[PDB]
Amino acid sequence: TTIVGVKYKGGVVICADTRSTSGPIVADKNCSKIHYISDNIQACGAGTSADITRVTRKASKVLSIFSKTYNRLPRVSHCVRTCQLHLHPYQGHISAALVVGGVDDTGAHLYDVYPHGSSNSVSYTALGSGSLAAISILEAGYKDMNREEAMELACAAIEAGIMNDLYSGSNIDVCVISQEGREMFRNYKKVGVRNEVPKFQYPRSSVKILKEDIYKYI
Amino acid sequence: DISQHYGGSLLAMIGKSSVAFLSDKRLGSGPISVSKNFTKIYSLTPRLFFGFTGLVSDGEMLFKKIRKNYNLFVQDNNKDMEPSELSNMISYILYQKRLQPYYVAVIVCGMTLDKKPYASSMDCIGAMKETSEFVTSGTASKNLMGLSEALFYPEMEDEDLFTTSVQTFLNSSDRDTFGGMGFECLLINPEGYKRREFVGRCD
Amino acid sequence: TTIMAVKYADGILIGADCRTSMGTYVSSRFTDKLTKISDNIYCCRSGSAADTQAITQYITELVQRSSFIDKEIPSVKKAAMAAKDIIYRYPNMLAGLIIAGYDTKPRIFNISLGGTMTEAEWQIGGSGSAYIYGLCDTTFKPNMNLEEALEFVKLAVTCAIKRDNASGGCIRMASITREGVQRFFYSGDKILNS
Amino acid sequence: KFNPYEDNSGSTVSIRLNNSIIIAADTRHCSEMGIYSRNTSKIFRIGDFLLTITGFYADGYELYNRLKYQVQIYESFNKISIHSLANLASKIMYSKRLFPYYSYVTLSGFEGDNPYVYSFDCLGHFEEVDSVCNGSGSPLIQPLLDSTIEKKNWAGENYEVTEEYVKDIVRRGFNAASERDVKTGDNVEIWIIKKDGMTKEYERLRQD
Amino acid sequence: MKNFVIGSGVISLRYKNGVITCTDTQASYGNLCKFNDVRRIFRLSSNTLISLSGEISDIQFLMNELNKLNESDPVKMSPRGYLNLVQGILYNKRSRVEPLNVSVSIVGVDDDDFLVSCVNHLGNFYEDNIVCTGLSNMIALPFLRTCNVLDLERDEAISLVEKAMTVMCYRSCRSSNRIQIGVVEKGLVDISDPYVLNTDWQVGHNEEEIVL
Amino acid sequence: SIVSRQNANTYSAEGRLYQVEYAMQAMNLGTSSIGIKTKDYVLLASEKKIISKLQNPSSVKKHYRVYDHIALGFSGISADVKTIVDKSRNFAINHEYLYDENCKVERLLEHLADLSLNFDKKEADEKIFSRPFGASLLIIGYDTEPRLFSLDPSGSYLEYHAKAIGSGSEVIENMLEQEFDPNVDINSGLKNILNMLSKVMKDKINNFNVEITAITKNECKILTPEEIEQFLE
Amino acid sequence: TTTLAFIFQGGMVIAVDSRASAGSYIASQNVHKVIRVNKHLIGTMAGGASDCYFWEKKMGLYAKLYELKNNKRISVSAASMYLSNCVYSYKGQGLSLGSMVCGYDGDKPVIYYVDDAGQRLSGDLFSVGSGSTIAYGVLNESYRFDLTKEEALNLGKKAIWHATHRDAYSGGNVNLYFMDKNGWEHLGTFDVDKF
Amino acid sequence: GFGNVGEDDLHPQIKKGAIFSPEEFDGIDKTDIFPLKKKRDPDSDHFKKTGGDDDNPFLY
Amino acid sequence: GFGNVGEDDLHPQIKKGAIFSPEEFDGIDKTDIFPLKKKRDPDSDHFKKTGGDDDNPFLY
Amino acid sequence: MESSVALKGNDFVIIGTDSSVKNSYLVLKREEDKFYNINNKVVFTYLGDQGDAFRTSSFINEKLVYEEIQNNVEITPKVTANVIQKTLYDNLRSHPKNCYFLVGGLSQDGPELYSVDLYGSLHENDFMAVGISTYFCYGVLDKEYHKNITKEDGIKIIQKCFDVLKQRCSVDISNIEIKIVSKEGVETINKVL
Amino acid sequence: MESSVALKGNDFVIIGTDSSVKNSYLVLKREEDKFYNINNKVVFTYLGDQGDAFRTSSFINEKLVYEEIQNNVEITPKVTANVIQKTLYDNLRSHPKNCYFLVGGLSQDGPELYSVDLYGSLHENDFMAVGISTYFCYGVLDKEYHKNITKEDGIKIIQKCFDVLKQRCSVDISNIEIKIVSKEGVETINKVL
């Protein structure tokens, strides 16, 4: 996958490819790799799919209890610290690498979190199998940007990973968190267009039923 | 390894207002098939089903755990569990053993309280993939996935769905050494479900 | 990595590169290696990225805690000692820190991988330090001024960057003095073009 | 420690009809974690026969060169039959038994009036098959041919298997493979071998 | 399989009327940049160039064999001929389980056919309009492919390759900013003197660091 | 040794190698044999060299099977032909091993021709002898057509419709202009070949001093004394 | 694979399964696991298909060359010994191969079980392959030297069918052969589904 | 050397199949964090110990 | 943990005697070249390769 | 390792187990009772590591007796098999037991016959063959077993299955103990093959 | 593993070997002839890997016949045993044969009985017990064997040793082939234990 993160003047852009894989076999299309953490924080991860969901779910709980208790929207640093304190004890056996981005009272923050619990505040990020293809676009095209230019740089970064990485493909999910709030673009692009194959129908006589038992829901 | 010891595969196709959840009735002991009548699909209700592939003991104990939790939940709510909630609960149960995971992959099928079809699947540690077209697991997972992608089209009628899913499963098992020859197909719909059993090459 | 710490006429000057890498790939080229423990104490982390971050997160609160229990400025000595216990008590944590600050006088403390804590007048660390031990030995001068010490760190880290592949990027620098902390920046444009 | 092989395999499918042979292969040359090229030909022709390669591309290219050299030597008197060529390929492959060619070779062609398709393993054993798929996408395509073309498990009347029908089935199978196979390519190179000649066609696949 | 002194990746692409090849001059022994003037672009003959990456000793051995074969043969060779020869050499070396830890890019211009090809340590080979070797294959190649190189004039192609090499310098430990560019056109073979790419780092500034 | 190898390889002022010229004389010193090839059958009749009647007539056989549907007749030094037959059998077995088919007869002829003059080699399995073989062979077989080939010690071979080798070779050749027509049936052609053999063979022709090999699309028959008697009477 | 060969009063019966697999994937279902080398000698390959087929076809050439040399059919003992020696030359190199070289030495039937370890056993009943153990059970219960030809064939046909019914690595068609003093005859390619 | 090809096919196992599989050359939905083979976090970039004597650790 | 003390004194072996033996904690007159445990000849004095990449050898 | 073959008829279940106790090289006993009888309605046999097997079976027996007497749990083959599955599963992932069982008896739904393997995998079937019998006797069971077998036919089928091991298996077996559970109690048969 | 027991008395030698050919899990055959009668005065049996054992035995038999006919070597148990030892030793360090022998016969010095183990170690003794018999049958041989045993007593002692193996060893043995070599010739006895 090619989950990417770009930080611009007043927010962050977190983009990802909509593909999942287990070996050489594609497992899930249109997969949503951007996980909810808070109204002002989103996380996108690569690695063990179950660990991304549960680690980002733990942060969502701790940040939801915090905001509800203290009536105070959580900081990105609080999300990263929660993830670090959870990932580090397991020595990376919980293999979850995240790109946590959000906007707080201190501004826009974008972090790279790695399975062993290290974090890194960054201006732009790429992660997953397509990170190298994506980081090449980010290196060449990154500058001080608004959300419009940040949107296209990140999408161009994902597009590079989708086209050049075997284990990346399908669509591009985009999510922008600005000082005005977060807005999502699911399947923002369909670069991996499929062919228009017709249908194929067997004759219903092609299958024989040995015995049948009917049960009714009540 | 342990999953290939017992073998077996699952397929779940979603049509229009119906789900075709079917599996092979073979139980393995390595190369040897110790039973031709071992169904891996469990029914909590006529609208909530799930099957396991992998270690058979893990699947059975997970079924008992899931039934315990589901019964407690239904008593606590008096509203029946949604299949999405059942899949999420199963995923949670799987992840509690993250450091000693179950060697099972679980598919969850059923009808929502809205009476719409539902299917999903999980890995050893609950990585859930909610499905709109189809989902597979087991030894014949790759053949099933390829043939379903080739043959599946959205909004199939109940009988066309049955025939297409049965053909895909038969032809995927025919190319899998550990695939069974006795097969069971639960055609699931808002009115209940129909347990149809069919046979293949008899080898 | 190439982390450097030199004590000069009126404070501490710490320099570091920006490159962080895994293998032949530079995962990031703007990483900040000068980790602030407090307003007057800075830690140059070297070793496991996750473990050194874990320590500096804990040392941050321990040094503040004792500072307000004691009711005085945070002690770089106490931060260094607090780091030594964690690095010593937990051999599984591959961490080596240069902790330098200014509480009453400038101090540099070097915690090796096994928890070996020594006080130094100048200290270098990281993979790239191996290539500037001779340069730092011959070029170091007691009681440098800020400009003389800034040149010394600039020269030493530059020559480590030109030789160590794991070291690259611009040279982050930070001078901790009694008056506060002032950050510097030696862009890689000058270093690479030379 | 040294790994002498690279898995460039995409997918190749060979189907023999009553009076024609349809050979199709994806054109992608896959590296690890990447794509070297999208227009490498996996199909080589030796006279009136088409050789199909998968696995390690260098091994298959070397095997094709050895086959061409041996067939050229043999052709000093008469044209080689498809059966003799298949046997020679089996012997050549087995000569490397201790350092095998990582290439699943499918040799197909006409012995006069009758089409023949031969499928080989890496150690040289060859079978005369009606439809065979090799490469990473083989499990994703072979069941489709077993069902729709060979009519396995088809209890009722069978749809007539004509050349165009089989070609469309092949395009369907390659679409499915490219959808679910990571290393299946961007274009499919389809050959139709008839008694008196053969012709190439190209079609597009998704380019992730 | 020698892994002592490694030269970083190669970049070769074809433009409207020629082919480019570019490599850095750094050679690394582990994490040490031991040599900074190791040159890995050679002209096999008029209208063809060969650029190599990998173990420098294997690079030198392979180029020595190629030079011997070039001086021995009384018959010229097209870039395709050199590609076949090098592929055969590398595949034979691999097949004797004595591989050269070297990856090669042969680029040349025939009467009208432009060759841009790659051969890796195993003897695997391919031909494409943009071929990259090593970590370049993952970093620079995805960036290069975003440009329709076929429509580029020589200067534009050189600038694009320079940008790709700058990205490689930024994002690879084993590559430097001192590059060497070889160009082949219908009547031209040129290998420039190695020159240093200009880089910028203003993205690293955080709040108020004094620009020293 | 180098001197013996040079003696083998010395050319004559006339050109042709001396050893080949001497093997030419050697190949003539043998009993007669006739080979006839037609549109549908190829025959090979040879006179047996029964040195004494105490010698077992069945044990002095003169035709060797080199493979399925290939038979070899010879004249000249009989000792050499054993090695040639063994080498030809090895070649045919190897050809089937590589290609799973019966070799074209001309393929075997080319292999033997290549091996014949390689006597200067030091390696052992790609030469026949250290000298030319002192025998002339009539190799018949069926691949897709009845084939008759003659391999002479000079290493050259020719495909023939009819040929005779042995001490009576020239007489049979001068007789073939009249007594041979490829249009006759297998039985009549066999009677003709037997008559031609009898016309030059030392003693009276009978079913025990004659060996007949007839190769056809259907069978690689070798006639027993009963059939030879049926054709003689 | 499951292969079966045994001797009874009327002659000899051979039966194989004709499946070939590569791990979980069934590569083929119509593989011919019997090498006919002459009218009175056949070999039942089992194990690495390429390995057993290659050496069996290499042994079939030795029998052909022997026939040319001596104008006489090769004995089963010499045919199997040639095969046994060839694999034995590669003992300890991981070669996997097991076969029965079945045939008649004139009036006498003999089956030689040969495997990659250089072993060579003559016997009246052998079963080789993954499903051999199942075949041994069905045979042990009902195998008799006094079987009639029809009983023996059905026993061999049924014994392989049971092994295929219970083993993963077998279950193609039941190729059945009957070898008598006058030679072998291919008695069917029964599909296990149509019993 | 020969790879034991067909051992599981040839013996009852009391996965070497008859035909050679491409594998000879886990049930968790795991993706790669970086394309690099087995790297997923920053390298431990300290100065690494070399030399001395690990054969005689106590001969200080 | 328990050390299998007595396995040889307990089983027919189809050297763990009943009593634990000293130095449980070759037929050549070898002796030693230096009192150091493994040292026999001068150390290999050169700059030793470290870093780079061993699990990605071909990604130059 | 240890062979055990069981059948179920219309109203009877037959379990036959190898009565000899053996190690790799030596036979320690030749007639060891490897069955547990519960209320004459359920008979279950234990196999595998004798040290683990007998301890687990004793715990199962005492737990079933306690649950019957205290909690009035109805002890059927299914309940016994579920308890065995739970006790094997609990230890499987921490401190595994190397033993496996066959549980047979009469229930309100007729005869039942369950097999619990090393990992706690539970399944019912018309006939069972565990140990080495899994590789030899399933062909014989398929050939001979049919739904309407009589008790004597079941005994003879068990005898044939163990005769296959006697004649073909390399490991020595001499004694088999057959316990037949039916509505008229449990019948024990000892045979020397 | 493959068991053979041999003993010698006055002017006779008894060699008894189990005739069953078997592997770890299967008994391939139950009556295989594992003896070579080089000449009616000497009989040796081969054991171990059948592929190596029979091949080495055939080579040794042909070498002994060749040496007897060409070089007039006197074939005696000692000469045969020395040939076994040389054949095994030559391959010991390059191509070890996993087989061992037991040579017995009559010479001008009287009965001789030699054991050539896996490594080529040759030694003469009054009675031999190779394979598992080394661990079970030496006590019985010590108890029963005495210098003046008769031929029938020797057969009975061999039977007792193989009965110990039948009763106690875990591996199944059913048939034993006994070949008595004496001035009368070689007498073959087949017993089913």
PDB file of C-alpha atoms in Angstrom, chain F residues 32-36 45 162-164 168-169 171-181 188-201 205 232:
ATOM      1  CA  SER F  32      28.351 -60.934 -52.764  1.00  0.00           C
ATOM      2  CA  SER F  33      25.148 -59.237 -51.649  1.00  0.00           C
ATOM      3  CA  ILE F  34      22.411 -57.327 -53.478  1.00  0.00           C
ATOM      4  CA  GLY F  35      20.144 -54.539 -52.252  1.00  0.00           C
ATOM      5  CA  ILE F  36      16.998 -53.600 -54.175  1.00  0.00           C
ATOM      6  CA  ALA F  45      20.237 -60.519 -50.051  1.00  0.00           C
ATOM      7  CA  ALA F 162      19.908 -50.951 -56.394  1.00  0.00           C
ATOM      8  CA  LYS F 163      23.478 -51.883 -55.535  1.00  0.00           C
ATOM      9  CA  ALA F 164      25.698 -54.931 -55.165  1.00  0.00           C
ATOM     10  CA  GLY F 168      30.637 -60.316 -57.415  1.00  0.00           C
ATOM     11  CA  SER F 169      29.666 -56.655 -57.147  1.00  0.00           C
ATOM     12  CA  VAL F 171      29.013 -58.541 -62.368  1.00  0.00           C
ATOM     13  CA  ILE F 172      25.768 -57.901 -60.497  1.00  0.00           C
ATOM     14  CA  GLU F 173      25.992 -54.206 -61.371  1.00  0.00           C
ATOM     15  CA  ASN F 174      26.359 -54.989 -65.076  1.00  0.00           C
ATOM     16  CA  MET F 175      23.426 -57.399 -64.668  1.00  0.00           C
ATOM     17  CA  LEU F 176      21.202 -54.868 -62.881  1.00  0.00           C
ATOM     18  CA  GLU F 177      20.814 -52.764 -66.029  1.00  0.00           C
ATOM     19  CA  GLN F 178      18.723 -55.655 -67.393  1.00  0.00           C
ATOM     20  CA  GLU F 179      17.378 -57.708 -64.480  1.00  0.00           C
ATOM     21  CA  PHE F 180      15.953 -54.853 -62.355  1.00  0.00           C
ATOM     22  CA  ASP F 181      12.675 -52.952 -62.702  1.00  0.00           C
ATOM     23  CA  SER F 188       8.877 -61.305 -58.052  1.00  0.00           C
ATOM     24  CA  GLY F 189      11.594 -58.837 -57.058  1.00  0.00           C
ATOM     25  CA  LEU F 190      12.773 -61.272 -54.396  1.00  0.00           C
ATOM     26  CA  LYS F 191      12.934 -64.035 -56.995  1.00  0.00           C
ATOM     27  CA  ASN F 192      14.987 -61.689 -59.183  1.00  0.00           C
ATOM     28  CA  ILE F 193      17.385 -60.858 -56.342  1.00  0.00           C
ATOM     29  CA  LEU F 194      17.803 -64.550 -55.535  1.00  0.00           C
ATOM     30  CA  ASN F 195      18.533 -65.340 -59.187  1.00  0.00           C
ATOM     31  CA  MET F 196      21.118 -62.555 -59.373  1.00  0.00           C
ATOM     32  CA  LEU F 197      22.753 -63.802 -56.168  1.00  0.00           C
ATOM     33  CA  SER F 198      22.825 -67.366 -57.500  1.00  0.00           C
ATOM     34  CA  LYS F 199      24.420 -66.208 -60.757  1.00  0.00           C
ATOM     35  CA  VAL F 200      27.640 -65.122 -58.977  1.00  0.00           C
ATOM     36  CA  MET F 201      27.671 -66.962 -55.653  1.00  0.00           C
ATOM     37  CA  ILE F 205      22.105 -71.435 -54.104  1.00  0.00           C
ATOM     38  CA  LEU F 232      13.851 -70.467 -54.793  1.00  0.00           C
TER      39      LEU F 232
END
